[PDB]
């Protein structure tokens, strides 16, 4: 009913609770400090896609076929039968890729053994650590360059994205485990510090990541104090990604540069070659520009059929060009920021301005 008030008593250690003591469960903020009372629907679907057990997609099967057709042909003749030689090892290039079952038990090994053994080592009895790690390997499988690289930006970003999801799902279930607060916080700082090289090496994967793990809050800058002077941007610099661009293959590098002899800008060499470097402008930047595009039609439709009003505002402005403050042009007159060029004269004499500074 009013701002909550704690009654601090100085003789004591620290205050009493509020009389509108609003919360009960401490609310769990992000890496940089904003709430979530639960994860997005993407991430709850990614919990049901983690606790039902991920099956190895058929992409590995088909790549094994059109890749090693001889091991597949061997398997093609050997389908179903108790195998005494591993004709799938090249299909599972590492312990971890065999996440479709338990203990890295590749599918084509359990044929002859009991159906009950096949039930024992299937996706149904995987431990919860097993299932989390299974999703982890599957994703680090489809985002990595070569199946041994686990230190690629996309590799690391996706791995820590799943990682921070399981962390948040842990927390939004159990609240007072604050070593795990400092688990999720630092882990997310690194996932951001990896995605902010991903979206600098190839953003396509970056957005597939964005829209499949629904984490934009760990890129979203926190404090304007920083991102006013561009420090949340300096990071992709500091890592060394100021030039990981390939404009020669996205943005035609011809006009993106001024000249040295002329001194003219990017858009003016783009003028003197006829190319259109300009972002998508929002509706505001569109309407301000359409309005700035019609001022001369306004002048032509103004002076021509109401040259009375043309003359009326002639009188208005023609008196004003002589009235007012100044009439000649001195540096004192037209120093292009009077209030701050002249500090000694703002509180006493020139009470037009209430502060000595309004711009950079």
């Amino acid at each position: 009913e009013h701002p909550s008030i704690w009654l601090w008593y100085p003789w004591r250690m620290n205050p009493e609770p509020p009389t509108p003591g609003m919360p009960q469960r401490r609310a769990l903020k992000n890496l940089h400090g904003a709430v979530f009372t639960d994860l997005t629907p993407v991430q709850k679907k990614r919990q049901e896609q983690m606790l039902y057990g991920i099956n190895i997609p058929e992409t590995r099967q088909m790549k094994f076929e059109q890749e090693h057709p001889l091991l597949a042909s061997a398997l093609r003749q050997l389908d179903g039968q108790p195998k005494g030689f591993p004709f799938w090892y090249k299909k599972y290039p590492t312990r971890r890729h065999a996440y479709g079952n338990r203990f890295s038990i590749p599918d084509e090994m359990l044929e002859g053994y009991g159906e009950e053994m096949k039930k024992a080592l299937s996706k149904e009895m995987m431990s919860i650590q097993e299932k989390q790690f299974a999703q982890e390997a599957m994703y680090m499988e489809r985002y990595a360059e070569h199946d041994f690289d686990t230190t690629s930006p996309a590799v690391l970003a996706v791995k820590r994205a799943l990682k921070c999801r399981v962390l948040r799902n842990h927390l939004l279930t159990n609240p007072h485990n604050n070593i795990i607060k400092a688990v999720l916080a630092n882990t997310e700082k690194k996932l951001s510090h990896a995605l902010r090289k991903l979206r600098k090496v190839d953003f396509k994967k970056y957005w597939e990541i964005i829209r499949d793990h629904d984490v934009q809050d760990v890129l979203q800058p926190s404090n304007l104090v920083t991102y006013r002077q561009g420090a949340y941007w300096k990071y992709d610099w500091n890592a060394g990604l100021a030039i990981s661009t390939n404009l020669a293959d996205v943005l035609d590098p011809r006009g993106l540069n001024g000249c040295v002899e002329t001194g003219r800008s990017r858009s003016e060499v783009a003028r003197d070659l006829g190319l259109s470097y300009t972002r998508p402008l929002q509706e505001n930047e569109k309407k301000q520009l359409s309005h700035q595009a019609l001022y001369y039609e306004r002048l032509a439709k103004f002076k021509m059929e109401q040259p009375e009003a043309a003359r009326a505002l002639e009188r208005e402005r023609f008196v004003r060009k002589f009235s007012g403050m100044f009439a000649k042009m001195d540096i004192k007159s037209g120093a292009p920021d009077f209030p701050s060029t002249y500090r000694k004269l703002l509180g006493t004499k020139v009470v037009r301005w209430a502060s000595k500074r309004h711009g950079p």
Binding site: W237, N238, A239, G240, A242, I243
Partner: protein, 104 residues
């Protein structure tokens, strides 16, 4: 070092006049002499220097200030994709050349 060496009223402890001429074109302090508010506190900043010092002309191989890893060269290398290392094999602060220059 010593006092008489800090006393800038000798000239030997000063960089001479003719270097503002060698910088801003010979006899270009005169067009500032002939100025209006010249003398009250400020004058036209007279650019007498050693020439081996200009931020303009010199390079990392001339100006002992340019190869300062702490903030200059470190950002240079984080920009130029070089391996920047504290006590690096290349004197400026670079461990070796970058992918771009390596190739091109």
């Amino acid at each position: 070092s010593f006092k008489y060496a800090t006393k800038l009223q000798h000239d030997e402890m000063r960089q001479p006049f003719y270097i503002h001429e060698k910088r801003h074109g010979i006899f270009s302090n005169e067009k500032n002499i002939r100025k209006s508010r010249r003398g009250l506190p400020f004058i036209t900043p007279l650019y007498t220097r050693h020439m081996n010092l200009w931020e303009t002309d010199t390079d990392a191989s001339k100006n002992r200030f340019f190869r300062g890893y702490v903030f200059g060269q470190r950002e240079l290398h984080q920009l130029l994709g070089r391996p920047h290392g504290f006590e690096a094999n290349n004197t400026d602060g670079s461990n070796d050349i970058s992918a771009y220059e390596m190739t091109t």
